[PDB]
DNA sequence: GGCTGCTTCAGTATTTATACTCT
DNA sequence: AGAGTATAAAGATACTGAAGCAGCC
């Protein structure tokens, strides 16, 4: 509604405002009821599908895993690497950013000590073991799992991880509901999946769709990331530092730039009115 | 001026707005309904007359034999209310209907009646409504909740959104009768048009169209327009008016009159349309290609061959055109078509129509309704005919007709109850026009599309059903003419009518026990609008859209008072001023805002008359002249809210409280509170259990009179007079003179009701609020029910409370309570469990009630008397015999395990014609001793006037005043009186005396008849004995309490008096709340109230001191006067100068414990006046004072807030919850321990508990929690033995419910077994 | 309904055949039609589809068994004949069912030997009332 | 009639069975009447329909209702739904040796103990009490012990607070969302009818004190006691197994 | 003839008014 | 337990999925 409620619970809401607040409140209450309703069914299905995973080994004997890396939504970071691997057995030994200088062995359980150790050394990503790629028939090995998360040590051999997982994912359920690149930080730039050309206005326009910018800090850990579409004019090339406030590239979202990436000529060939094209005098400029 | 029951204790009333409409009688719904259900009325209308005139008169199978209706009447209840309440019968009345059967001359309709025969017949026995809108069904007291359903008529639904996921919307139309069958039209993703009946399989609409005897040419003539082509020199120039060409492209050379208007390829502009229209072109050349896709309306016939040169609804062509022009046919008729203005939706359906003639359509309909039975002409004919045009199987009540003729924008509000062809046609036309875009769908939850039933309407409908069955029967028996012996009685029966009425009242979803533990729970169980039951929604079926507040609820339903839980918004409770319109639509008062004044000529407005004007809001200032002092007024016009001028306004609300219900119009400082918490507050306020002693609310809303008066627990004077004899269980008032008619000298005798088990096992007992020898007037309260006080409402006790943490004993929401509350016993309550035992009669003879029962020691029998019944007053614990009863071989009524108490009353009923006991004779004779008393009193008060006349005649004739006072006053005629007219007068007055004596003997003998008699019982019962135990449970750690502002809590610790925070003046607090509860649960009211509370008590201790030590009355007069003015320009304006210098002392004696303060909801008291009142006392305007500890005596820094808050007590008493179980009763199908507290039931160890106990490595506890402790039969016996023998160990075995599952599957053809 | 005249011919034919064994299916269909029609009377067709089907099957078997004895030389209407047969079988079935229900009640009301205290009144002194109400027979 | 006190049920299977046999019997008798095969066919149709409605009602077009229009429960419907043997009696069953009450605070408690009203504790541990009595010789027959306990003589209380000494109880709340909705304790006797609860643990239970209720269970064998003491005790579960954050945050 | 968009259906969250006569 | 019996036309969930089925290029 246009007009808001310009009073508070120390003055007195007059009638209409009390009415409107009432509407909102009852909506909330009905939501809560049906939300408990749905979440119950959801957690039931969850506990049913797993229902049987029991840690029946100690090491499945594999060297696979996921490259755990801190998540970044493009601007601020969403989670430091310390958490994602806090208490999870790494697959292979990790190297300092002094390459060929390991920092921790290959098959060690990463409690807080190694967490801070990797934290200061500016480590970026680690191939950590996982359960999705575990190598066990009828169960999972302990190491692939990690730490019990209720006791500061590896999970023992026999615990029913499936049920605790189901319950943990389901419980909070009732709490749920129902341009350009204006970089602000200072660091090195990296490009990814690049094909481009320097324009007739001095700048370099990128002309692919797998393109992505990764802004590293001075150290070697990525801090920002951004998407640039087919044909966006970068202000700066790779490797150049950048300050906060200024853009690095901007395109036209309201059209599809389809510049060619060679030198030559063009024609009005295969463009014939009546059957293929139409005569059109521009209704804003005229050309 | 004030009622004399109010000058005892006035209430200081804030609020500045002068009210103009007194709150109406809060129970007008039930009474005003059951009034228009039993009332003889002309012109049919409502009531029974409608049911009769809608079934009667009936005639035989052309036997010239009729059975017609004459009149009706209701005789009388054989019993007054209370006797039905006691015996266990239905307070009811008999229906005598005057009927007549007539048989005309044989083979002569015009002929004379061969014989008339009239009679009056007993049919059915209908219950009656007390003066409190209730029924008494089997002793108990029921009530019929109103219902909220969808009005009868036609609704144009949209069904937007998820239809086909393509995005295109649909439209559909439902026509809903009051009784009959719905009919549904609906479109298609393919933009076709379909019909279905009773939500069945689909069909094309042209089916229904033809089955009304419609030819295809008639169809096309009705729906579409015409475009004609006429032979010319060339090209078939078409007659035309240019209106159909606005914005259309020029499919040819738009040229006429020798000049071009629009070139082909260029669309004809609206300006070009205006040019054409001013030019008035009519004929235009048209190429023969442009007329390729036109469809022809009416078929053409050749002249010479006389053939079908063209049919109806045919796609035109070139050769077809040539053949048509070949047969001389100048005119050619096609349909004008478009795609945004006149969509062609009928033609396609006609093309997909698998039917051409009416008969095949009727066959199609029959098959879609009845499968299995092949077609049959007259069968399907009658089926379709009576399915929608039978006066019997289909009806729109007058409201349906109103809604129908209004939705179609017609004006005549009076029509038939059956349909009509033109009406279905107009439905389809309107649905199409919606499909084009002229008109909009209707919203469902709107309150112009729903209506409320009542008890009258539902009862009347059940009565119609009964009449229908009886009518079928009596018509049958009229095909068996045995004349001159068939009076109109043996033809008629009454058993099905009575069965239907009794089955409705005594059992339904809309017939509930009265929720009776509060003078408010009642008055809220009768203003309940439920949207469930028959013809309504369902819990797991209703949607999120009806459950919300619509902007049309403003003044017709409370938005904040609904039961939270699995059904919100369904059982919303009616508003305060909400009437019911003539047809069942709610309405609301508003005030005519004429040119510049706000007069008081009020009007009621429904949900549709309102949505046109602009209504101001309640709180809008104006200066003693009508004119708004402001110039821009807030208003709400049409589901909106915005500023408006000083002249646009039309109406203005009545009073600021007309938005909330009554169950929440009591909470003060509502506008200073949340919404969730106010909701929980009202829903708790309807649960307060009546305590031992009642006490006024220190700070209230000024709406506590009209809740006690308008409910029934009080006892109110019929007519005024002067009190003459009060007594702890009865009041007798000598009526005034003019309030006394010539007969019935008259003294009202109110027999107050003592301890009587209410519906939730809580005593009620009115107590007198007057004393011997004081005036009363009509309507003044005399006795006070449970939870009333001096005429006002009082649900709980107002205590002194301090807001601060205290060592965590009020951690989350717990409450801390002193011992000046468990000692003063101000939260104790009385409970009344009733038990009954009956003497049935099985084989081997019946059972008896002898005080001699077998194989039991004397110790038990000690409390039993000779008859076999425990004495009144005995104290009984669990497992004791109260009535002896021996079976033909013991069946003695024991005490239910767990409960204690002291017997307070015993009842005994005997089938008249069974050997009586002693106790029955005792209760009978005492009832006689009490019953003679009132008649004796009326007797002796009446005898006075006769002897007064005796003295008046004896004064002339040598009066001797010194002898007429020697011998008894019956000797007032024997003195010396000469033989004059006066001696004849003496004889006449003596005969008058003896006549009155005969009358009173007759009355007392009629009472003796009604008492000493037996009574109709359940045949098979010899005697029925009833015991009334009673307990007094006080308070403990575990009970629940709550304020009025949604702040509930479990009392946790009972505190010694010397540990409580006491202020600098020794006075300890009672209760220690928690402040953390406020800032999140934003209920500021509970704190703000607490300030005012203290202030009020401050004026109490200012009088108590002024009055305890003596003080002249002039000072108290002056001080109370000051306290009563105390404000801004408020409405109260009471002056003690008019009082009589004595009752002032009474007023002070009532105030002396606090001056009660009123606070209208949205006209409350501001902070300035709260502080002004606090200053009139002496307390700090901050409202916070310094306290001390009681355990250490060291001051609390940070001054805390103490005051007086009105605490309740909710009846979730812990002893009703606490429950355990060692080993009890198993079931038979599956030997799992039973469930519940009534039975000795175990606990529910559900799924989730098994998941959780499984997440731990807990593998043995999970085992024993489902094999030994529940089901393994051998295992659990061995477990009991090993537990007694000090050996904690188990032998698991295999469960039993599993083997049940096996034998249950294997009982199907499924071989399920176990391997090795 | 079905014609009254053709049934005469069909039954005469089958009776002549009996004088030589099975009925023509036409008269069987006619009997089924009339039985199912009477099923929709007002005094019946009022309570439940679980009984009504049993009544109809019983009446059909009764009328089939009883058509063995139909006088052909007199009383030329068999409409009323079949109606009466199915009517009688209907009422017998209704009696049997009602008495089986009363058996359930009478077994109930004779069991006050359970676990423990606080037995009801209505729920128990109402089954008795129905347990006696049909016992008026 | 099942006859589990109070209301009497029907055990509706009987009804169905009867009808089947009924029609079956009827069919046989028509094979002794040589009826028009249209009627034998109609009877076979009825028989098929009846057997079907018995095995799994509602699967055929219309379900049959006994009264109240409530479709009667066929055989298969004793296994489907929320109420078949599976979701009602094989997974979650009711249990003996259990109780229920309202809860309160008692902020004087340690972390590994909870309140337990004297009445309830007396009712739950009864067979243990009988065992100790018949061990000490304070009675001879079981009924002697029962009457002794019933008169609540001053000797039963020392026996009680003896057996309680290290006998853990399991407390539970209604919606058992996660693993920390059921925890073990060692109880101390209380003069009331309510359960004391350590104010730090009312986060795992998500239990306010607006009148919530809780259930009490009692392990019996050695293994269950050892497990409740070493696994589910309230002083072993301080780290929410979802994420290792502590769950004993003072609220 | 295979491929494809509607279409229909299946799955989930106490308490019932009336032979007759034998035999 | 059985058996002869003769007017009668007597209804507002909401969402998801998978096979079936008419039709087309
Ligand atoms: Mg709560
Ligand atoms: Zn592994």
Residue numbers in the entry:
A (entry chain D): 755 to 932, 948 to 1056
B (entry chain C): 2 to 890, 915 to 1341
C (entry chain F): 10 to 29, 37 to 153
D (entry chain D): 253 to 503
List passages from the publication reporting this PDB structure.
The structure of RPo-gp55 is determined at a nominal resolution of 3.6 Å. Gp55 is composed of five helices (H1–H5) connected by short linkers. As predicted by the sequence analysis, the folding of H1–H4 is reminiscent of σR2. The σR2 homology domain of gp55 binds to the clamp helices of RNAP. In particular, three negatively charged residues (E70, D74, E77) of H3 make electrostatic interactions with a positively charged groove of the clamp helices, consistent with the previous report that amino acid substitutions of these residues strongly disrupt the gp55–RNAP interaction in competitive binding experiments. The σR2 homology domain of gp55 mediates the recognition of the promoter -10-like element through interactions with nontemplate-strand ssDNA in the unwound transcription bubble. The σR2 homology domain of gp55 unstacks nucleotides, flips nucleotides, and inserts nucleotides into protein pockets at positions -12, -9, and -8. In particular, the adenine at position -12 is inserted into a deep protein pocket, making a stacking interaction with residue Y97. The HLH motif of gp55 contacts the zipper and displaces the lid of RNAP. Strikingly, the HLH motif chaperons the template-strand ssDNA of the transcription bubble.
Bacteriophages use bacterial RNAP to transcribe their own genes. Herendeen et al. developed an in vitro system that leads to the current understanding of T4 late transcription. It was found that T4 encoded gp55 enabled RNAP to execute low level (basal) transcription, which was further activated by the sliding clamp gp45 and its coactivator gp33. To initiate basal transcription, bacterial RNAP needs to form holoenzyme with gp55, which recognizes T4 late promoters and confers the ability to form a catalytically competent RNAP-promoter open complex (RPo-gp55). Gp33 and gp45 further activate the basal transcription activity of RNAP–gp55 holoenzyme by forming a catalytically competent transcription activation complex (TAC-gp45).
